[PDB]
Scaffold this active site. Structure first.
Site, mmCIF file in Angstrom:
data_model
loop_
_atom_site.group_PDB
_atom_site.id
_atom_site.type_symbol
_atom_site.label_atom_id
_atom_site.label_comp_id
_atom_site.label_asym_id
_atom_site.label_seq_id
_atom_site.Cartn_x
_atom_site.Cartn_y
_atom_site.Cartn_z
ATOM 1 N N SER A 113 10.146 -15.469 -22.153
ATOM 2 C CA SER A 113 8.880 -15.306 -22.898
ATOM 3 C C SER A 113 8.317 -16.657 -23.336
ATOM 4 C CB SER A 113 9.004 -14.373 -24.110
ATOM 5 O OG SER A 113 7.745 -13.720 -24.297
ATOM 6 N N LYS B 4 2.000 -11.305 -21.110
ATOM 7 C CA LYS B 4 2.468 -12.228 -20.064
ATOM 8 C C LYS B 4 2.601 -11.510 -18.724
ATOM 9 C CE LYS B 4 4.913 -15.584 -22.980
ATOM 10 N NZ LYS B 4 5.113 -15.006 -24.355
ATOM 11 N N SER C 138 3.766 -10.364 -26.580
ATOM 12 C CA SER C 138 4.176 -11.049 -25.316
ATOM 13 C C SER C 138 4.164 -10.184 -24.046
ATOM 14 C CB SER C 138 5.545 -11.703 -25.484
ATOM 15 O OG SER C 138 5.450 -12.917 -26.225
HETATM 16 C C1 PNM Z 1 5.596 -12.877 -27.575
HETATM 17 O O1 PNM Z 1 5.753 -11.778 -28.102
HETATM 18 C C2 PNM Z 1 6.235 -14.129 -28.158
HETATM 19 N N1 PNM Z 1 6.239 -13.947 -29.607
HETATM 20 C C3 PNM Z 1 6.190 -15.008 -30.389
HETATM 21 O O2 PNM Z 1 6.202 -16.150 -29.934
HETATM 22 C C4 PNM Z 1 6.178 -14.758 -31.911
HETATM 23 C C5 PNM Z 1 7.531 -15.092 -32.510
HETATM 24 C C6 PNM Z 1 8.485 -14.102 -32.734
HETATM 25 C C7 PNM Z 1 9.726 -14.424 -33.280
HETATM 26 C C8 PNM Z 1 10.034 -15.741 -33.605
HETATM 27 C C9 PNM Z 1 9.088 -16.745 -33.407
HETATM 28 C C10 PNM Z 1 7.855 -16.406 -32.852
HETATM 29 C C11 PNM Z 1 7.639 -14.305 -27.514
HETATM 30 N N2 PNM Z 1 8.155 -12.968 -27.211
HETATM 31 C C12 PNM Z 1 9.171 -12.513 -28.186
HETATM 32 C C13 PNM Z 1 9.849 -11.318 -27.506
HETATM 33 O O3 PNM Z 1 9.787 -11.274 -26.253
HETATM 34 O O4 PNM Z 1 10.417 -10.509 -28.254
HETATM 35 C C14 PNM Z 1 10.199 -13.642 -28.342
HETATM 36 C C15 PNM Z 1 11.043 -13.512 -29.615
HETATM 37 C C16 PNM Z 1 11.179 -13.685 -27.163
HETATM 38 S S1 PNM Z 1 9.025 -15.036 -28.456
#
Ligand code: PNM
Length: 456
Positions: A285, A44, A41
Site C-alpha cells: 500500500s 490503488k 487505499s
Molecule cells: C491507504 O489506506 C493507506 N492509508 C494510510 O496511509 C493512512 C494511515 C493508516 C495507518 C497508519 C498511518 C497512515 C495505506 N493503506 C493502509 C492499509 O492498507 O490498511 C496501510 C496501513 C497499509 S497504509
C-alpha cells in the site's frame, strides 16, 4: 448474516458490502452496495488498472542530467539541468552515480547555473482533501517530481538532563534540512505533560521547528518527517554530490518549472518496470508510488504537466473508454486513496474488479494483490485467518482513522471465485477502548468471510 455481524461492530459503524461471482451480473451479497463511501487505499486498485492501461507494464520513471552548451577544456559553457521525473524510488546513490558519469564524460566545471527541473508536473504536490496535519508524516510526504530517498528523513530528539532546559535534536549531516528546537524538557511525571503537545512546524526551505514539551526519557525519541520542498532538497543533494566529485560552478541552483526542450542526456537513471512498482504498491500500500503514478497518468494521457485534476480526468476517461466502466458520480481525488474527497460505491468498485478478473491473464493483476496469510498487508489479517481463508483471499486493504476496507477476490469452498468490496467507515470506539479498537473489526471479518467461504 450481515446485520448480525454488524452488531459486533462499534455503535453506528457504516457498512456498504457487495459480493458477486466472477463474470456474473447479479450479486450474491448486497448490503448498501450502491451507497457512496470513502475507499481509502482500495483506490490503488483503480490507480493500478488505469496505470497499466495508460503507461503499460514496461513504463519506467526516469531522471536525467542534461547539458545545454558546449564543453571546452572540461568547462561546460552553459547550464547543467537535472530533470526529475517523479521516480518514487530514486536514491542519493543514484544522484551520486549520475554525477560520477557527468565527471567521467569530461565535465569538471559548469560556467552557468544548475537547474532543478520539475516541469514534468505542475501545481501543488499535495492532493485536494489531504489533512494538513499529516503533511509532515512520511506516509503523506508530498509526492513531488523531485524525490530522493522517499523525501523522508529521520531525527533523534533528546531530553535535557536538567528539566526546564531545551530538548535537543540530532540529525545526520547529509540531510539538507534545518532543525530548530523550542522543546521544553519536563520532569518524568509532570501534570503539564497532560495538555502540552509535542509538535512539528514546517517552514520554507525544509526548515522544521519542534515545539512544546517532552517528558524526560533515558533514550532519545526517534522521529521521521516528510520533506515539504522536494526541489530544494534534491537540489541540495545534487550540490553536495557535485562538490564531492570536484565539479565547480559559477551560477546558482535555480528551479526550472516550465516545459522546455531537453538538452543532451549525459547521465540517466530509470526505475524498475511499472508492473514491478505496482506490485510493491499493491502489496504494501505504497502511497508515494500510487500518487506519482497517478499524476504521471494525466501527464501521459493529455500531454500536459501532470496535475491532480489531469490525473482525475485521465483515470475517469481510461476506465470508461478502455475498461467500459462509467464511474458516474464517483469522485477520484488521488491515486493512493488518502484523500477524504475520494467517494465511490461498492457497485462501482465491483465493476473494476470484474474487469480485472476478466482480463487477468492479460494484466497479471491478481498476483500483485496481498495474499491472505502469505504476503503484503494481509500476511497477518486476523479476521481472515480466523475465517479459515488464508491462501484463498487476494485483496487490497484500505485504512484511515475510522475506515477499514477490503476489496478483491475470494475463492470459496466450492471453488467459485467471487469478487467482493467491503467498505466500513464511521468506525469509532469509546475513548476508554482505544488500543483494543480493532477487536470488533476482527470479529466482524472472521464471521463474514467464513460465511462467504463456507456458503458459496
Ligand atoms: C491507504 O489506506 C493507506 N492509508 C494510510 O496511509 C493512512 C494511515 C493508516 C495507518 C497508519 C498511518 C497512515 C495505506 N493503506 C493502509 C492499509 O492498507 O490498511 C496501510 C496501513 C497499509 S497504509
Amino acid at each position: 448474516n450481515v446485520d448480525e455481524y454488524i452488531t459486533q461492530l462499534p455503535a453506528g459503524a457504516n457498512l456498504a458490502l457487495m459480493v458477486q461471482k466472477v463474470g456474473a451480473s447479479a450479486p450474491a451479497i448486497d448490503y448498501h452496495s450502491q451507497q457512496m463511501a470513502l475507499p481509502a487505499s482500495t483506490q490503488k486498485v483503480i490507480t493500478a488498472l488505469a496505470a497499466l492501461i495508460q503507461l503499460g507494464p514496461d513504463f519506467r520513471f526516469t531522471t536525467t542530467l542534461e547539458t545545454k552548451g558546449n564543453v571546452e577544456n572540461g568547462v561546460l559553457k552553459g547550464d547543467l539541468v537535472a530533470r526529475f521525473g517523479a521516480d518514487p524510488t530514486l536514491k542519493r546513490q543514484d544522484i551520486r552515480n549520475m554525477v560520477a558519469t557527468l565527471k567521467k564524460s569530461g565535465v569538471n566545471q559548469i560556467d552557468g547555473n544548475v537547474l532543478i527541473d520539475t516541469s514534468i508536473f505542475a501545481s501543488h504536490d499535495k492532493a485536494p482533501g489531504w489533512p494538513w496535519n499529516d503533511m509532515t508524516q512520511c506516509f503523506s510526504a508530498p509526492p513531488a517530481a523531485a524525490i530522493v530517498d522517499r523525501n523522508c528523513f529521520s531525527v533523534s530528539l533528546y531530553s535535557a538532563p536538567k528539566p526546564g532546559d531545551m530538548a535537543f535534536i540530532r540529525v545526520a549531516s547529509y540531510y539538507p534540512v534545518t532543525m530548530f528546537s523550542q522543546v521544553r524538557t519536563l520532569p518524568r511525571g509532570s501534570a503539564e505533560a497532560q495538555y502540552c503537545e509535542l509538535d512539528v512546524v514546517p517552514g520554507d526551505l525544509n526548515r522544521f521547528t519542534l515545539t512544546g514539551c517532552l517528558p524526560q526519557r533515558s533514550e532519545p525519541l526517534p522521529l521521521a518527517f516528510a520533506v515539504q520542498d522536494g526541489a530544494s532538497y534534491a537540489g541540495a543533494i545534487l550540490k553536495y554530490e557535485l562538490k564531492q566529485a570536484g565539479i565547480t560552478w559559477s551560477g546558482t541552483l535555480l528551479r526550472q518549472t516550465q516545459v522546455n526542450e531537453p538538452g543532451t542526456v549525459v547521465a540517466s537513471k530509470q526505475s524498475a518496470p511499472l508492473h514491478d512498482l505496482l506490485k510493491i504498491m499493491l502489496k504494501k500500500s505504497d502511497n508515494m508510488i500510487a500518487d506519482t503514478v497517478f499524476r504521471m497518468i494525466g501527464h501521459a494521457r493529455f500531454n500536459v504537466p501532470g496535475t491532480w485534476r489531469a490525473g482525475s480526468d485521465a483515470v475517469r476517461q481510461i476506465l470508461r473508454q478502455q475498461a467500459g466502466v462509467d464511474i458516474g458520480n464517483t469522485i477520484i481525488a488521488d491515486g493512493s486513496g488518502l484523500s477524504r474527497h475520494n467517494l465511490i460505491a461498492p457497485a462501482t468498485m465491483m465493476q473494476v474488479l470484474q474487469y480485472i478478473a476478466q482480463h487477468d491473464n492479460e494484466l497479471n493483476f491478481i498476483s500483485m494483490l496481498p495474499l491472505a496469510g502469505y504476503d503484503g498487508s494481509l500476511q497477518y489479517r486476523a479476521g481472515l485467518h480466523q475465517a479459515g481463508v488464508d491462501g484463498k483471499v487476494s485483496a487490497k486493504t484500505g485504512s484511515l482513522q475510522g475506515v477499514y476496507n477490503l476489496a478483491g477476490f475470494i475463492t470459496t469452498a466450492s471453488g467459485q471465485r467471487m469478487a467482493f468490496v467491503q467498505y466500513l467507515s464511521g468506525y469509532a470506539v469509546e475513548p476508554a477502548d482505544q488500543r483494543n479498537r480493532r477487536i470488533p473489526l476482527v470479529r466482524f471479518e472472521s464471521r463474514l468471510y467464513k460465511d462467504i467461504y463456507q456458503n458459496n
